[PDB]
Assembly symmetry: C3
Homo-oligomer: 66 residues x 3
């Protein structure tokens, strides 16, 4: 709900996920959300955006055991 | 509404609603939000963006059932 | 907190806060959310963005009244 949308907002503003991947984060399962979040954080690292990586990982942490 | 915010997020990132219309989605009635979402989906369709149209329509459907 | 993410989305759309500040708005307490939202509204007003400014103001008020 709110946590998947947090992930969505941060990942979209980072430009780290494609349209399909964002669609899956919004309409898919929680496991898919966790996996795309991990990919998003790694991509945020790769762009030099350490802050976004830290935010995405904290959100994924909330998303995980849930 | 978390779903109204989903509509807000997707429509803003796609450019499917104008600034005023996004404001209306947040501060307007539920019917106004649904109708602006449908307009956003129709505009995305008109531009050929089927992906955005499919997501917007799913969100609007959730808005209707609530 | 649907309202905290609502505040986050609107404050991010203005470009008034840095990535760190947005991180605090999303992952911090409600008090930090109120203070950074007020900062975002003040900066947006200063940049000429009325609509964003007291949309944020209404949001911060909702956040404060629990
Ligand atoms: Na079409």
């Amino acid at each position: 709900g709110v946590v998947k949308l947090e992930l969505f907002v941060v990942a979209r503003s980072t430009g780290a996920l494609s349209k399909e991947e964002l669609a899956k984060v919004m309409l898919g399962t929680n496991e898919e959300a966790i996996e795309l979040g991990e990919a998003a954080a790694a991509r945020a690292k790769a762009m030099g955006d350490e802050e976004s990586a830290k935010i995405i990982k904290a959100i994924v942490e909330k998303l995980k055991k849930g």
